[PDB]
Design a protein around this ligand. Sequence first.
Ligand code: SF4
Ligand code: SF4
Lengths: 391, 391
Amino acid sequence: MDDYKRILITKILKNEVTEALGCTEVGLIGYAVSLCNISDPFSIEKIELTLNNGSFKNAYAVGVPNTKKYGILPAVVGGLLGDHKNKLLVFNGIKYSQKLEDFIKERLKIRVINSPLYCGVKIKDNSGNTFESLIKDNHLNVVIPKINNISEINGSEKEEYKNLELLDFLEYIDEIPEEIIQLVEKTIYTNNNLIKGDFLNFGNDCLSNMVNKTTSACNTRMIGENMPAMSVAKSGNMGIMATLPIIAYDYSNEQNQEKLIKSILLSVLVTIYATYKSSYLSSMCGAVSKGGMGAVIGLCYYKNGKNIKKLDSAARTFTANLPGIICDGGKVGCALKLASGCFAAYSSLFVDISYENGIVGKNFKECVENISEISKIMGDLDSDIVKIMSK
Amino acid sequence: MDDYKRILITKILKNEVTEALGCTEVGLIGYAVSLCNISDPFSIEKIELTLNNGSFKNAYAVGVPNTKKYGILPAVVGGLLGDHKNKLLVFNGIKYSQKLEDFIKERLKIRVINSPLYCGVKIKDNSGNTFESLIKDNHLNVVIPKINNKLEINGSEKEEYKNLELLDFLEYIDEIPEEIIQLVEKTIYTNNNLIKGDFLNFGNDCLSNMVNKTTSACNTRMIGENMPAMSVAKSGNMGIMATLPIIAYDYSNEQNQEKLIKSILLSVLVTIYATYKSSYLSSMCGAVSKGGMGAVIGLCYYKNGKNIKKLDSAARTFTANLPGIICDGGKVGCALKLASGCFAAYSSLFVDISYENGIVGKNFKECVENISEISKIMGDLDSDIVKIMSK
Ligand code: SF4
Ligand code: SF4
């Protein structure tokens, strides 16, 4: 309808919807290690990787791409075996060497700190030369190798998007640009390609299929497969949680192409909105919360159409069900949490919760605001989580 | 099994498994208001009710018995229309007056504080007379007009229970005392009687029945029905979460009486164990976590018997799945959380999660310890929750 709204929404959709190969933390580690640019990885005497609590937590037991392994050492080995030009896709075209893994295991000294995103590599060789590199802050800004390159959008556009209402999103999915239609279809393609086998199929009903497909894709992403995931705000698990429940609901129901496209577009819009509103860092599972808000809004739009009260009731029930949940790092178990998210969405399509019930917001906007504020209230827990995992 | 162990377990089961009549918070409010003993409720100029964060949270939007209403204002009206001699049962035999509700709404000024259980009523009338009442610490201890009440099992027995292992519980459910069998049967009867209709039934399969029955009983308990619930550690919703999933699994499967008895007994033992180990207060949903640990251990004992690795895998998957959910007070939405708990239990019976996946413990005891530690780390946080709910 309005022109500026369509332009802003299109630009932000083109900005936030990317292709992420596995977890951004292991990619970060490999990219920093390749930014050190070691000429001979077998001439290394000591490697000193420094991470913050969140990075160490997320990368402790997540699958490293093209290594068939888990942990931070495979990411460091892949960075040694990678090229900086691939940036976050550092693990492309590599040939994993178990010999180099055994070589670096004796020399990789990892040290954790309490701070925002921090990734500092300091490598020494046999000759004595030292090579340092550092990536800092939430935006992936390299401060030592100085290699200009992620996914930046100025604050004015973010503030203008935060001031949009759900009716703007409902009117956008009726006037979808063709480029955005292809982007949504590419999203569906990328996230559906992540379905590899059965992980949690306990029936043939709709919720069973939703849980099964979502957990299968999450397990595929967590075991270190060389397959990208269509991520919103560089969080692939959030994109999985936002898309696959709707994909499996549509697969179990009408099998409508345009309808699934519109529902997933609305889900991505809602997920981007919830990510913007949750401005502060948090140890709460942002994937489950945000991607599930997007998924439940998309499922409610699929079930009831452009019904405002239905969407508000779905948001209220989702806020009542599963708000506040730990983010104990990238793991194979993360899939389970997303499974719960599926539940949290499905059960919200059949129950209405009054606004008085606890932290439930008055409508969708207040639900998102309350979830974001609670995420802010939970505060920094990554220090205690990393202290737990060290035992 | 050892004799002292059996005696301790029997004593702790008889102590912790009680019968709780509805929600205690609205009873507290009504009793404090009725202790003022207002002769004419329509001669009131202003009421000043003071609660602490926890009390305000739990009583903000919970159903008041015999009022057909929700919130703190209905509790205040029922206390004005009740007699102090009824103590926590102030709402018995009353006839709710909407006129008095509309009168008191204009004059009830509620103020929240940071302290243990605190309920102070200060009413003024047209003549100028003032009436004060105050309840502090435990529920039954009113300090104004000075009717002291001191709050069963010494700490040594709790510590001895903390040092028990899951094998002790598995051996206890084979030599059950007859009194304990009667207690389990009364528990099953009481908690199954709370099922009034369908609240979240989206099928006739096992998980559908589990979620449906659990949510139905929780909704019955939350709307203010005059029906007692068999509570573990005075938390009726925790007892529901611990018992009803197993009841509905047995209902949908083998229909075995003794097997269900043993499974629910093990669930209650596990729930008491998790409550004892989580000694510090927390705003995390203790009902879901503890009762669901009990429920998943009971379901795994029902499915696989006295298999240690099966129980360890179920506990690990439960710990990976749904830890750290908010406890935003007693509400109709609480049922949803318990529904999620059902999910978290069922999905743990078919998946194994490695201990490396985040906060997952090496076995059952380590899982409980990590969950308790995270609960302790989350702290109080009730002040921020009530600040959110105040809008
Ligand atoms: S728990 Fe959620 S937010 Fe945390 S790593 Fe797993 S998917 Fe991401
Ligand atoms: S949110 Fe959880 S802990 Fe709080 S009252 Fe409801 S069931 Fe109990």
